[PDB]
Amino acid sequence: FTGFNTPSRIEADIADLAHEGTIPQGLNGAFYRVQPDPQFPPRLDDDIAFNGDGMITRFHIHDGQVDFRQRWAKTDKWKLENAAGKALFGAYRNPLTDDEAVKGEIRSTANTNAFVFGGKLWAMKEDSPALVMDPATMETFGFEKFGGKMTGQTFTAHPKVDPKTGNMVAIGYAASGLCTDDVTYMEVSPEGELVREVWFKVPYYCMMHDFGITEDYLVLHIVPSIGSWERLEQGKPHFGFDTTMPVHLGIIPRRDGVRQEDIRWFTRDNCFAFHVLNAWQEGTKIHFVTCEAKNNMFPFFPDVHGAPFNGMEAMSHPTDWVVDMASNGEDFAGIVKLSDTAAEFPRIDDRFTGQKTRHGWFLEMDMKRPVELLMNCLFHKDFETGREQHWWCGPVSSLQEPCFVPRAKDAPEGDGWIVQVCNRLEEQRSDLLIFDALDIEKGPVATVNIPIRLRFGLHGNWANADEIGLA
């Protein structure tokens, strides 16, 4: 709650932000990103940054200028707390520490991702229904339960769009209640109607924060960041990592009326994997590129056996998990490390989700760079040519999730730009950087001064003027 991460709680508007360079005329749409930002002082003692109320930033880029708008995501939690004028909810994913006054309420802070789909803005916390908002006015409508047709109590913060159907693919884990081994597989039409919701069990309850899709399958990685009521009763963090448990990859056919028996389960040795770059089918093989670390990535979700955090072992690298559908038995066809670069927050050109993509972008941790006072490089890989580009934000800055933007509705994979918030840490201010996606190492084409300090953000997405009602 201090330093770079001073609370903000500023809703605002500013037209035509100052910039150093030229803003590409091609850009006509909006980058939406979210920051955890607590409305009130925390109810408990040392709450996590990951746990603040969702504040949704939007950078509307058009006619070679940038406009700012930041609004609260008005969760049930935000409203009840607002009215009550005080914190009513407790720790991250721990209903046990809530005021009795808010028992049975939707605890979502809608603080993890901000996503445009079917002419709505989705503010997402994977423990809850998505909060929907107006993409243009950025008013809150309320949580999306699709007219009581959703039966699952949760919705992913890492949804995927099938380019073929245009559908949104989603899971919801702890679907029947907290720490349950149920999971819903959902699909949503471009119009916004919920068209499919399949229940199924997973080998064990764990953090299923993400997944892949291919042309036919949902690929779901099961990594033993595990939880239980036991943990919560003793007031431990909701999740802890168990290095002694196997890692699974479930293959769910994306067709109507699937059963547990249709789901193919592969198993490998213990590792930590987190965010999914992309997956595709290669005949009978499925390629699943995730950012794999040797061990636990999150100090705050500790080793369940009291073993202390191993920073070295938390370094993640893009990795291909391959599995053959046509085989028998649980073994992986193989595991291929795609780069020695330490990377996470992976992005693809969304238009090619499920097809083998040539390009990926990541936030990189390069410990060889000076720091004169932490994710300090933008990283682009050409998987065809093997060629890796790096851009460094310099010694007093750090970077937030990059967001790919197409040059046109019809441009090749990777022909466009990268937009990303940059933390000017020593100056306690923020920039929006705009790069050539395919030549990032020459530096950003435009450095845009953001006249409000933004906090450590999480996930963010692009939409055209035509998808958000600013045509």
DSSP characters over 8-71: ----EEESS--EEE---TT--EEEEEEEE--SS--SSSS--GGGSPEEEEEEEEETTEEEEEEE
Which residues line the annotated binding site for Fe(3+)? Answer: 158, 209, 275, 459
Beta-carbon contacts of residue 259 (< 8 Å; ≥ 6 apart): 200
Question: Nearest 5°: CA angle at 127, between 152 and 270?
Answer: 105
Rounded CA separation 320/328 (Å): 20
Beta-carbon contacts of residue 266 (< 8 Å; ≥ 6 apart): 248, 249, 251, 323, 330, 331, 332
Q: Within its chain, how far is the Cα of 169 from the centroid?
A: 14
Q: Within its chain, how far is the Cα of 140 from the centroid?
A: 20
Element (H, E) at 381: strand 377-382
**Alpha-carbon distances, residue 20 vs 205, 227, 445, 452 (angstroms):** 49, 47, 9, 17
Rounded CA separation 117/124 (Å): 12
The structure was resolved experimentally with X-ray
DSSP letter, residue 371 = -
Rounded CA separation 253/214 (Å): 10
β-sheet with 140-143: strand ranges across: 113-117, 120-124, 131-133, 140-143
**Alpha-carbon distances, residue 376 vs 275, 368, 391 (angstroms):** 18, 10, 8
Rounded CA separation 120/386 (Å): 38
Which residues line the annotated binding site for Fe cation? Answer: 158, 209, 275, 459
Please, what's the b/e burial string for 53-62 (b: 16 or more CB within 10 A of its CB; e: otherwise)?
bbbbbbbbbe
For residue 280, the enclosing domain spans 1-471
- Resolution in angstrom units: 2.9
Q: Strand 285-293 and strand 316-324: pairing? A: antiparallel
Tokens 């699943």 identify what position? 288
- Give the closest residue to 332 by CA, choosing from 367, 376, 285, 383: 285
Please, what's the b/e burial string for 415-429 (b: 16 or more CB within 10 A of its CB; e: otherwise)?
ebbbbbbbbbbeeee
Q: How many CA within 13 A on the CB side of residue 414?
A: 17
Let me know: does 250 contact 261? Beta carbons within 8 Å. no
Rounded CA separation 348/365 (Å): 19
- Give the closest residue to 230 by CA, choosing from 244, 242, 240: 240
Element (H, E) at 448: strand 446-450
Decide: helix, strand or coil at residue 303.
Answer: strand
Tokens 């067709």 identify what position? 255
State residue 192 phi and psi, 5-degree precision. 110, -10
- Amino acid identity of residue 29, one-letter, is G
Rounded CA separation 304/152 (Å): 28
Rounded CA separation 145/154 (Å): 9
Tokens 């109320």 identify what position? 53
**Alpha-carbon distances, residue 460 vs 7, 177, 244, 400 (angstroms):** 20, 28, 34, 9
Rounded CA separation 223/206 (Å): 7
Beta-carbon contacts of residue 153 (< 8 Å; ≥ 6 apart): 128, 129, 172, 174, 175, 176, 177
Let me know: does 161 contact 117? Beta carbons within 8 Å. yes
Rounded CA separation 344/316 (Å): 7
Element (H, E) at 467: helix 465-468
**Number of independent structural domains in the chain:** 1
Rounded CA separation 117/189 (Å): 9
- Amino acid identity of residue 440, one-letter, is I
Rounded CA separation 172/152 (Å): 7
- Amino acid identity of residue 280, one-letter, is W
Per DSSP, helices labelled H in 198-285 are 229-233
- For residue 85 the two structure tokens come to 């004028």
Element (H, E) at 77: helix 76-84
Rounded CA separation 334/341 (Å): 20
**Alpha-carbon distances, residue 171 vs 88, 126, 182, 282, 286 (angstroms):** 28, 9, 10, 24, 19
- Amino acid identity of residue 388, one-letter, is E
Which residues line the annotated binding site? Answer: 158, 209, 275, 459
Let me know: does 155 contact 148? Beta carbons within 8 Å. no
